[PDB]
Each structure stands twice: as C-alpha cells, then as structure tokens.
C-alpha cells in the first residue's frame, strides 16, 4: 500500500520542475535515443509523391531532475503526465500531415526510471513526401526517406542517435505493400546546418521495388493484344475495304484510349516513362498496319504476305529490346 | 548547475508580463523582421486556382520586457512558452486553409536574446489562392503571390520588413514542381490602407513557367495523329463508301472526345485557351476531310489528289502559325 509513498515521490519530482528548460540546461547536450516500430505503410501515392506511415515512435533520454530513490521499480505513469515534463521537440522534416491517435486516450507512454531515464512513446500516423523518379516506371525502384530532426534545439543542446544501432527500427517485415516490396532499409545519423544553427538529423530510408505483375495484365497485355488484332487485317482480302479499314481504325483508337487512361493515373511529369515508350511503339505498329492497307489499296486501284512476316518479327524484336533495356 | 538561476531569471521576466500589450505600447511601432525558408510547393491547382506551400516562418522583433542580464547565452525555451509571450498577429491575406504542424509537438520555436530580441519560428503548410490567366494555357506563365500582413495592429503600432533584404526568402531551389519551374521570386514591402487604417504588407511572389513536355504527349500528339489518320481516306478509292465514311466519322468523334476530356480538367473559364484553339483547328481539318469525300461522292453519283496536297500543307501552315504566335 505504498501508493501514497509513490504519490509523494512523484509530487516531489514535479515540485519546482520547469518544463521550459531542457535537462542540463546551459551544459552538455542531452542525448536522445530513438527507436521506431513500424506498424504498416498504408499507401504509396505516385500522384502526390508521398507515403503514409504508421509507427511507434520511442524517445529515450535521461533527466536527472526526475531521478528517484527508494523505489526499485520503473514507474509507468499516465500519459497525461507528459504535459508536466520536458520532451524533445522532435519533428519530421519531410512530413505533409501527421497526427497522434487519441482513442480511447492519446497513444502516448511515459515510463520513468530510478536513474532519471525517461521513455516516451507515441503512435504516429504520418504522410511523408517522397519524390519519385518515374523514368523507368513501372519497372522503377524508389527510395523514400523519413527525416527526423529537432526543431528548436541545436547540436549544442540536443543530440540524436539510433538506440540499438541498426536494430533501432523494427517491424519492416510487417510492411505489406501490394505494389511494392521492401528491398532494404538504412539508418543515417548526421548534422544539418541552417541559418539558425546546426541541427541533429536522423534519417530512415526504404528502397521500394515496384511489382510488375499488375502492370503486365493491366497495360502490357491489352497493348499486345491490340497489336496482334491489327495483324488480322493482313489475312483479310484486299477487296474487303470496309473490314480492313475498320480493323485499322479500331486498333488505333483503342491504343489511344489505353495511352490516355494510363497518363491520367500518374502525375503530369514532362519526361517520358518506360511504359510510355512501349505504348508509343505499339501505336506505331498499329498505325503502320493501317497505312499498309492504304498502300495496298492505292496500288491496286505479295505486299500483304511481306507484311505478315515483317510486323510480327519487328514487334517481337521491339519487345526483346524494350525488356532487355529496362531489366 | 545554474538551471535554478535561469529559472529565476525567466520567472522574473514573466512576472507582471502582459501579453495583451505589444512591446513599446503607446510609443514607436515595433519593427518585425521576417524570413521564410521554403520547404516545398506540394501542389499547384488550376481548377481551384491555388497552391500549397510548406515553409518555415520566422519572425524577429525586440521586446525590452524580456531583456535579461548575467547570462551570456541565447535562451532556447520550450515552444509552450510562446503562450505567455506577445507575438505579432501575422496572417496571410490570400490563404485559403493553413495549419501549424503539431507532431510530435507544435512546430514552434522560441529563442530569447540578452538584449530582448525574440526569435519566433513556425512550420506552416498553407494553401494560398492564386488567380491564373489561362489564355495562353498550356504555354502560359503564372505569377503566384503570398501576402503577409498584420491583422489588428496598424502601421502606427507595427512595421514589417524582410530581414536580410533579398536573401530573406531561401529554399526556392528546393521547389520541385513537375509541371512548373520557378523563373524568379521577388520580395515586396508596402503599406495597404483599409477603413480601419493602414497596415504593413509583405508580399512574396513567384513567376511560374509551365512545362510543355506533358501536354505535347498528352494532347498535341494525339490530335496530330488523328488529323493524319483522316488523311488516309484520300488514298482510299472512292467506291469504298463504307471505309472512307467510317474513317471520317471516327476521326471526328475521337477529336470531340479529346476536346471534352481536356476541358474537364480545367476550370470553367469563358474565354478560349491556346490549347482550345489548336483543338478547334484540328477539328476543322478532320471535319473538312469528311466533307471532302461527301463532295467526291456527290459529284461521282483529281479531287482526291488535290486534297492530298492541300490538307497536309494547310495543316503544316496552321501548326507553324500557331506555335510562332504562342512562343
């Protein structure tokens, strides 16, 4: 029944405590250890060039003002006690919109230690910007980072380090992206200098490899089928003007619709993507097929057989070059 | 171990401090220096005529009530101390929706100085309205501004200036817009008079040049290909009524679909854009091509050869005039 004794101990710690002053104010910088437990990566958006990350953000630092004696236990206090304690001004530099879950209470943990060590945990869902190079899309590889920095305190007042070395960030295997796979993750600690001063920086980066399975069925297969569809006109007799012309028109129009649909699902980038090159190549073959019959119709008022062997061969050669270049 | 001495010094500063009164109340106006560190420009929306801006907003001013002696250091206090200090009522006049990031704490910095100088920094994501002239779209150039003004205090009570002159705003090179490029940025300081009084105004303006690479592939190229597609009917024999008529219909219908799709991605402006003029011109050529065969069919129940040389030549002339006018 030492709850009163614990209450007296905690009240003594908070008596005269100044939240406005960091631990060891005016002296050596306070070292803050950080570990991240990744819950999931909900979305990866190419149009907005950002990803949504949910994680458990733990911060580890020692505050001698909170040291207590006579209690051989780690005091796990209510999350509302964090308002009366100094906490690092940690923020994410590249985030676009973040929040802390508050159901049924704020997703916050405070755990004191006899030596003054403070454990501060937060469950944060953050949307962090990630610039993407879509030149090799959809066969591209992306590197999305999460920048962690102190906002007000410089390196003279605070220092950041990954607690546990390369094992600071866990839960990477929990990431289940339908479109991407986590090839590798890295931890970087460095100092970044601004006009106000030099600030400690922690960076967490993931290398994402896009899955080609969806795009083969969605885009590449329909484009090939339309190109094969245009080859049917070669076997049709030249006197069937309505049939062969209709086949050329529909394949060309269908190719345009596929190309327009793809570009509407991606940001309006000026450079040409890998998928755009394939669609442009497919459009050339179907357009040449319709031009081939126009040449046949013009001379008539052997050529078809020559077209039956060149177009499938050239298209196969085009596919071989395209896939080798981008793989 | 002078934390108690610092605590006594800070408590003395805030004892009797009145947040309701500006520094030097009833006397000379307080000069506020402002610097902006641009983080990124996330979006530029033509439909909503606004852009999203993330930046570090720093305010510099001197408050003699906060001057302290005996501490040869700059007191970097917790961000929660800003609630007990007077801050300028700075607001953005042209913003539509703005907020201050609050993860893991509010993105706010307070840094006092021995002479009473106060540094106040905020990380703000703002959506500022920007009226756009789309007459030359997509070859247009846009000038988006960010208006900074005091809400309650007039020029007799507060003054704004860019701290550092033309170097007040940094991070412009960090802006990576896929559709726009930052040609130039300007800093303007002026006074704006309302009924309540004259107020200090700071303006930050960017000149944006749109990238034509996306629109060439998305819109201009399909329009040209459809126009070339209509020219195939000239080489088709006139007796193939079904083939030539089908060619004319499909090109006309496809041109309409392209025109409708483009206008759905832009605000419902009454004036004609540059891209609209090109689409209207392309529609004329394909419509005339179908009318050309109707004339040929009518006279039959030489003209085709004359059409084979006029339409490509006129279309090339139309393209030359169009591009020279808008470049």
């Amino acid at each position, epitope marked *: 029944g030492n709850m009163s004794f614990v209450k007296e101990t905690v009240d003594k710690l908070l008596k005269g405590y100044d939240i406005r002053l960091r631990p060891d104010f005016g002296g050596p910088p306070v070292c803050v250890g950080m570990n991240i437990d990744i819950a999931s990566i909900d979305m990866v958006s190419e149009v907005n060039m950002d990803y949504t990350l949910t994680m458990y953000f733990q911060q580890y630092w020692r505050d001698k003002r909170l040291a207590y004696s006579g209690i051989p236990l780690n005091l796990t206090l209510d999350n509302r006690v964090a308002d009366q304690l100094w906490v690092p001004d940690t923020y994410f*530099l*590249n985030d676009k919109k973040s929040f802390v879950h508050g159901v049924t209470v704020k997703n916050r943990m405070i755990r004191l230690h006899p030596d003054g060590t403070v454990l501060y945990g937060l469950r944060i869902t953050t949307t962090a910007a990630c*610039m993407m*190079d879509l030149r090799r899309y959809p066969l591209d590889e992306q*590197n999305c*980072t999460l*920048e962690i920095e102190s906002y007000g305190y410089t390196t003279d007042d605070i220092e950041f380090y990954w607690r546990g070395g390369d094992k600071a960030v866990t839960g990477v295997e929990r990431i289940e992206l339908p479109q991407f796979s986590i090839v590798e993750h890295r931890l970087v600690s460095r*100092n*970044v*200098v*601004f*006009a106000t001063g030099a600030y400690p920086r922690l*960076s967490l980066s993931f290398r994402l490899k896009r899955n080609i399975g969806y795009f083969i069925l969605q885009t590449y297969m329909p484009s090939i089928l339309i190109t094969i569809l245009s080859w049917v006109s070669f076997w049709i007799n030249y006197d069937a003007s309505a049939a062969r012309v209709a086949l050329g028109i529909t394949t060309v129009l269908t190719m345009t619709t596929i190309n327009t649909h793809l570009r509407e699902t991606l940001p309006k980038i000026p450079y040409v993507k890998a998928i755009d090159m394939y669609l442009m190549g497919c459009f050339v073959f179907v357009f040449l097929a319709l031009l081939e019959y126009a040449f046949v119709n013009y001379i008539f008022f052997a050529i078809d057989r020559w077209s039956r062997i060149v177009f499938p061969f050239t298209f196969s050669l085009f596919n071989l070059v395209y896939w080798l270049y981008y793989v | 171990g002078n934390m108690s001495f610092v605590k006594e010094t800070v408590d003395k500063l805030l004892k009797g401090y009145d947040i309701r009164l500006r520094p030097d109340f009833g006397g000379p106006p307080v000069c506020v220096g402002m610097n902006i560190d641009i983080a990124s420009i996330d979006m530029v929306s033509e439909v909503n005529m606004d852009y999203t801006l993330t930046m570090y907003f720093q305010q510099y001013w001197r408050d003699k009530r906060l001057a302290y002696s005996g501490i040869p250091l700059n007191l970097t206090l917790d961000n929660r101390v800003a609630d007990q200090l007077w801050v300028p009522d700075t607001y953005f006049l042209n913003d539509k929706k703005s907020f201050v990031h609050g993860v893991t704490v509010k993105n706010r910095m307070i840094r006092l100085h021995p002479d009473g100088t106060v540094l106040y920094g905020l990380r703000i994501t703002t959506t500022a309205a920007c009226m756009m002239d789309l007459r030359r779209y997509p070859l247009d150039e846009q000038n988006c501004t960010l208006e900074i003004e005091s809400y309650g205090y007039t020029t007799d009570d507060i003054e704004f200036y860019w701290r550092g002159g033309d170097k007040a705003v*940094t991070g*412009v*090179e*960090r*802006i*990576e*817009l896929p559709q726009f*490029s*930052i040609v130039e940025h300007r800093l303007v300081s002026r006074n704006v008079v309302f009924a309540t009084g004259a107020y200090p105004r700071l303006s930050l303006s960017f000149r944006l040049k749109r990238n034509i690479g996306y629109f060439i592939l998305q819109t201009y190229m399909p329009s040209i290909l459809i126009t070339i597609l209509s020219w195939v009917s000239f080489w088709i024999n006139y007796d193939a009524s079904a083939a030539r008529v089908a060619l004319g219909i499909t090109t006309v219908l496809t041109m309409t679909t392209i025109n409708t799709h483009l206008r759905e991605t832009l605000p419902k402006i009454p004036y004609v854009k540059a891209i609209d003029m090109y689409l209207m011109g392309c529609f004329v050529f394909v419509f005339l091509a179908l009318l050309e065969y109707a004339f040929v069919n009518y006279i039959f129940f030489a003209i085709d050869r004359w059409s084979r040389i006029v339409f490509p030549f006129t279309f090339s002339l139309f393209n030359l005039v169009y591009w020279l006018y808008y470049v």
Partner: nanobody
Framework: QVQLVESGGGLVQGSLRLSCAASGHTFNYPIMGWFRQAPGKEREFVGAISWSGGSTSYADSVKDRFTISRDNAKNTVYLEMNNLKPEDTAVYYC??????????????????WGQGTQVTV
C-alpha cells in the same frame, strides 16, 4: 552514390569556364554547388544550381560575374568565370547535396565532392 569530376582550370592573366560532370544516383542529389578554398582561408561557397528547373543562387562576391548553368544530357554542371580578379585564386570544388540536407551555403551539408582544380591569376 555520385561521382564528380571537374576540369577546365589552368592559369590565366579574362574569361574562364569550369565544368563538372556527374554520374550515379543524381536523382537523390538534385542540387549541385560550387566551392572554392583559398590557402589558409575556410572553404567558400560560390554558387549552387538545381538539376531540374535551372534555379540558381550566387554569392555576393561572385554575383553578376559568374554564371552557372547545367545540361542534363551530359549530366554536366559548368561554371563560367568572367571578369576575373586577383581575389579569385583558390581551389574550385564541385559538390552535390541531398534533397533534405539544409542550406546551400554550408559545405558540410554536401555529401559528394570532386577532386578540385587550382586556379591562379
């Protein structure tokens, strides 16, 4: 991983054009900077430019005298030094900066550096 090679120095009494070729993961480092280090003096920022958009910044000393531009076809950033002065005698370096590495003017924010060319007038 970005490799930087610079050339085009020499000794002159004039107009000179430095150049810097980049190779590797240039997308992760879209900002290229130019630095010079006088003997005994600390390394000095000259100018910076982005790979995309061509936005550029310059120091006051070299303002209106040095022009910086790049071509993405060759992945080359070139510094054009016109109206040279005796104060412009230092080893010119080429550097690349990360997307979230901070200010341009501070050399410590740059990760990859070139060999450096000595220019004396």
């Amino acid at each position: 991983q970005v490799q930087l090679v610079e050339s085009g120095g020499g000794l002159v009494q004039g107009s000179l054009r430095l150049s810097c070729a980049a190779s590797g993961h240039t997308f992760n480092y879209p900002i290229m900077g130019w630095f010079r280090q006088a003997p005994g003096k600390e390394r000095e920022f000259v100018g910076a430019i982005s790979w995309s958009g061509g936005s550029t910044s310059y120091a006051d000393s070299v303002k209106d005298r040095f022009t910086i531009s790049r071509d993405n076809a060759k992945n080359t950033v070139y510094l054009e030094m016109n109206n040279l002065k005796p104060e412009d005698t230092a080893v010119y370096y080429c550097a690349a900066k990360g997307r979230y590495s901070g200010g341009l003017y501070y050399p410590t924010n740059y990760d990859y550096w070139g060999q450096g060319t000595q220019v004396t007038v």
